[PDB]
Write a protein that binds this ligand. Sequence first.
Ligand SMILES: Cc1n[nH]c(N)c1C#N
Length: 165
Amino acid sequence: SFSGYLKLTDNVYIKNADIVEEAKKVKPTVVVNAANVYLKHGGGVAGALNKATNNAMQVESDDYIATNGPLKVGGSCVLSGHNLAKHCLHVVGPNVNKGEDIQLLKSAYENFNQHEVLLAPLLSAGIFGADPIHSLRVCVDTVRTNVYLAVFDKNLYDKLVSSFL
Ligand SMILES: Cc1n[nH]c(N)c1C#N
């Protein structure tokens, strides 16, 4: 199972780790992808997870979009986890670099409550432009299920832990 995680709350855990390496090690039931509405997995966590699946995640995602149209910002869909997890929960956090409403970050985290346990990144953090300290606070105050957060950046991980209320 999950190892080396620091417990933040009753249900939120955090580790300085690459979510792709973490997924290959643990093979969780659910890995969360930091998706966009088009499921175009170009960069950040999405690009890394997709590259780990040899582009199978992108092929599956394009078929999903062709059938269903784009997701909503704050929404999600469950697709295959390929070689990383049983399932991938593609969650769209607001991209503040695209002028999207940051109030939608709580709606994005609410998707995690449909799964008992998840391996996840901080939503809207990194290339999505939001403050990761704010994302962790919204995560802790929204998610009630067991969430194992993988924070790639060491310096950000230390800042998140040392500033956690
Ligand atoms: C989380 C995570 N895992 N691997 C990455 N490249 C990220 C980011 N950002």
